[PDB]
């Protein structure tokens, strides 16, 4: 039985680059901004 969430869902809104968990999905939406300028983690490097 390959099933997923049988019971309650899950509130986990992690970022993309930094992959930071944000209890609130909205808060993250705005946070993502931080990744728009300096060391945005776009071009492969480091």
Query: Quick one: which segment of 5-13, 18-26, 36-44 binds Zn ion (CB under 5 A)?
Result: 18-26
Three-class SS state of 28 = helix
Q: Residue 36 is encoded by which pair of tokens?
A: 């728009």
Three-class SS state of 35 = helix
Asked if 13 is part of the footprint of Zn ion (rule: CB under 5 A), the reply reads no
Query: Quick one: which segment of 4-12, 15-23, 37-45 binds Zn ion (CB under 5 A)?
Result: 15-23
Among 18, 21, 25, 30, binds Zn ion (CB under 5 A): 18
State whether the Cα torsion 6-12-13-17 is positive or negative. Answer: negative
- Which residues contact Zn ion (rule: CB under 5 A)? 15, 18, 20
């Amino acid at each position: 039985g390959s099933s997923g969430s049988s019971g309650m869902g899950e509130k986990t809104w992690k970022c993309r680059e930094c992959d930071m968990c944000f209890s609130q999905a909205s808060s993250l939406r705005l946070h993502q901004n931080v990744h728009v300028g300096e060391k945005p983690s776009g071009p492969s490097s480091g």
